């Protein structure tokens, strides 16, 4: 627990402490005007004043209770406020300072020839399974003949009413720039 | 326990154990008052009047024990507030050197330092993020061709029945302010 | 009790004021946590590739 | 909570935009794991066929 926290801690408890007086008052001042009902039905006057001013004095301790209370907690509630912000500054100090590090040891420079190098990578492997899949391809060259799959695709269109034909082989902006391109 | 809090302890029983001495008297008074009544009836005027003193003595007894309690604990509630103030008093002061020492160590130009350097470490964050996008973007470029997402959005937007067209691309205080820079 | 009750109304704007900045930073920093191990993995990936 | 309810309206889109990046990169890292495999097996086999 932080030396504010602890701090924290015994300004909310003695503000708690006063509003427990207040109440306290409160429920003794209603026994002391019972009390002085009581004495006046007996004619003990002496009495009855003993109460009456207890009465009166426990009415106005109540109040003083209850308004130091609400000063304490007010004051709590802004120590509050400093405990939360100090954790808060701490742990914004704190990522400043872990970014900082990190923004050196991979900058912005760094992290573009990684990004590149990705990509020229990928680029490679793309050639390689291109050149698996047609060493595959005319391995298996008999397995599957041409005009078989021809065949088998025309027929499953002819199934599904489909009019594209499946023998033969199966936008005009670039058309448009091919055709600037070779006009200059 | 404070030395106060002993003090504040003692008052608030002996104010105790002043209310239970008025009310014994209160007690041994109705006591004497049933003793005069049997001492009248036998004719026993000498015990009589002892049982009458008696009762007389404690009815004001019990005023006096009733009054000092009552003074008593007037003072144990004052005591109460020196000792909660005393308390308050003390957790405010140490609130008062936590906050200088650490209002000391992070001042507020060193705090508005380490918030730009924050601002600008989430910029840099931001161009890295840019171009780690823009890396993935390119890298999966046939993956993702422009015109089937087009043709894709405007299919959901034609079974939605909205009249945006997703072909195409897709305020008046910026453009007057626009228009005065260069008009001067 | 009036005094505490407009305290403690404008209390609860300032802690959830706050707690929205709060909120703010943390979704921020929650970014550069992700993408620092994105990038890391990536590094990795790119490393092992070549 | 209006500005809260604006920022995480265009925080979502941010996140569900790169996860979508970080997915793609990771459906490509998923090839080269597969066709790493593919391709040692292969080796594998043409020398014990050889």
């Given at each position: 627990m932080s030396n504010m926290e602890k701090h924290l801690f015994n300004l909310k408890f003695a503000a708690k402490e006063l509003s427990r007086s207040a109440k306290k008052c409160d429920k003794e001042e209603k026994a002391e005007k019972a009390k002085i009902k009581k004495a006046i039905q007996k004619g003990n006057m002496e009495v009855a004043r003993i109460h009456a001013e207890n009465a009166i004095r426990q009415k106005n301790q109540a109040v003083n209770f209850l308004r130091m209370s609400a000063r304490v907690d007010a004051v709590a509630a802004r120590v509050q406020t400093a405990v939360t912000m100090g954790k808060v500054t701490k742990s914004m100090a704190g990522v400043v300072k872990s970014m900082d590090a990190t923004l050196k040891t991979m900058n912005l420079e760094k992290i573009s020839a990684l990004m590149d190098k990705f990509e020229h990578q990928f680029e490679t492997l793309d050639v390689q399974t291109q050149q698996m899949e047609d060493t595959v391809s005319s391995t298996t060259t008999l397995t599957t003949p041409q005009n078989q799959v021809d065949m088998l695709l025309q027929e499953m269109a002819d199934e599904a009413g489909l009019?594209?034909?499946?023998e033969l082989p199966q936008d005009e902006l670039s058309q448009r720039l091919a055709r600037l391109r070779d006009q200059v």
């Open positions: 009019d594209l034909n499946m």
